[PDB]
Design a protein around this nucleic acid. Structure first.
Ligand SMILES: [Zn+2]
Ligand SMILES: [Zn+2]
Length: 57
DNA sequence: GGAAATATTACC
DNA sequence: GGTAATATTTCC
């Protein structure tokens, strides 16, 4: 079966993936960076952001 | 089978 | 550059 966005019609592979896509219509940002405050739309995107805070040699 | 992580593309 | 958005891969 298919999981189509009821807002823009675009189709995604899973229910979980459609639910991540739907975050673009609401503007929600459920993943915060405790260092600078900035909020992000996925876990992975905050994760990649956290690397910009690494002194890391 | 499908959520989750991630690799990748798209967009500014 | 770096964040947004999704496509592909890992994991149960
Ligand atoms: Zn949509
Ligand atoms: Zn930050």
């Amino acid at each position: 079966k298919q999981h189509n966005c009821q807002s823009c019609g675009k189709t995604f592979s899973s229910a979980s993936a459609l639910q991540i896509h739907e975050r673009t219509h609401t503007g929600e940002k459920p993943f915060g960076c405790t260092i600078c405050g900035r909020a992000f739309t996925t876990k992975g995107n905050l994760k990649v952001h956290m690397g910009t805070h690494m002194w890391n040699n």
